[PDB]
Amino acid sequence: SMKIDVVTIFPEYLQPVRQSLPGKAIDAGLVDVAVHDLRRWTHDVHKSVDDSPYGGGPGMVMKPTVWGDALDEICTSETLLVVPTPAGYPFTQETAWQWSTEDHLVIACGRYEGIDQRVADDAATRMRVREVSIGDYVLNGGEAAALVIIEAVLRLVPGVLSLLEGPSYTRPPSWRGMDVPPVLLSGDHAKIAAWRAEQSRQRTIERRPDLL
Amino acid sequence: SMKIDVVTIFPEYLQPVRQSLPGKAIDAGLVDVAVHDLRRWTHDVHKSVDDSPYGGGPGMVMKPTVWGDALDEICTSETLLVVPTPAGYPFTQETAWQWSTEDHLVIACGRYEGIDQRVADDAATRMRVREVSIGDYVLNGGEAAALVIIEAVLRLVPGVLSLLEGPSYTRPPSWRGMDVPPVLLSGDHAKIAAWRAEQSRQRTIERRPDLLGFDSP
């Protein structure tokens, strides 16, 4: 069983991934994804989740008192707290494999300039906390990051959801003047494997030379 | 104004585009996002979009005929065709800046093992095509990649408008016995700027040493 709790000021963002889960997996208790509106834990009539940054400058920072109450309710000692942030450690396939055997993931979705750092610092004194970036670009909020993380993790949980892969082909064998490489139709499966290995080598050199 | 068309066999998964700033920039009329069900271009009653690979291997490959018909209708020679794929060139902030000036993005979302390579090759004879990865992990489909790309681009379009950022803080100045760093309360702009620059470079060497030219863990 895995439980994923997502905390966000835009709970509707996560609803399609929630409905995408197969009923058989939910019934078997293999997975449970719950989404929580952060404003449940606000203190004031205006339901304030952000405030001006200390030290000045642009933007707003999400309030520690709101997030602290939210995580106090949702997390336990067993929780892995995931904090999406462009300033995080890289989220990779290795991370996804590690997290796919966790019992309880809580994803704290930030907005504006992010969450007051004391929230993560305090949480880290009683649970495991992981600040992660999903790539070398800037999003407006953590919800899209949460969707990526949930998909990448849950497709590694059975029954729920370095060279580059080369091109793939299906019917018809000729289409708009372009033929499927004839080796693929040859029935020489050792040669096909060598051909695919060379295609992967060339693609990796062209697109991802960092992978060598 | 920018037009973004997203083509997918799961158009409901794109409903989050209507949320937050993508939703607002849509509402503000700076960008129009249209989502298309790929199965509209099928002709059989089983509405088949996939078929087994040539040369063997597990899984299914998305058929070129259906994609070619869809892109024929949606794309023009001015279109920038975006094809999410874990085997793509990296999508980065620089890419987002470049695409923020485009008139027309079309995002072809794959499923199964991906789209027959000839779809991108054929499209590239008429238009610019970019196969891109959003990161070093594997998704089940291109729809989440589409949402990431749209978000990153739309916050840069004119009309809405290196190193890791260090920590941020807001009120109260002491919380659960944890204090905001006193320099941030001090009003000394030069000392605050110097502390923030130091925190940024310190976080970068710890979390992303590659950005400063050092070996990765």
Ligand SMILES: Nc1ncnc2c1ncn2[C@@H]1O[C@H](CSCC[C@H](N)C(=O)O)[C@@H](O)[C@H]1O
């Ligand atoms: N590349 C990325 N990976 C993961 N989350 C990201 C992200 N880019 C933006 N976000 C999310 O969007 C929110 C707003 S970005 C705010 C943080 C600030 N821009 C910084 O540089 O640290 C973040 O708190 C995070 O939740």
Ligand SMILES: Nc1ncnc2c1ncn2[C@@H]1O[C@H](CSCC[C@H](N)C(=O)O)[C@@H](O)[C@H]1O
């Ligand atoms: N890192 C990534 N970046 C962009 N798109 C991705 C992606 N990972 C998966 N996808 C999308 O998800 C689809 C299916 S993943 C393609 C099969 C893959 N070789 C595998 O290991 O199973 C892709 O066609 C692409 O649209």
Ligand SMILES: [Mg+2]
């Ligand atoms: Mg942040």
Ligand SMILES: [Mg+2]
């Ligand atoms: Mg995965």
Ligand SMILES: [Mg+2]
């Ligand atoms: Mg790649």
Ligand SMILES: [Mg+2]
């Ligand atoms: Mg694709």
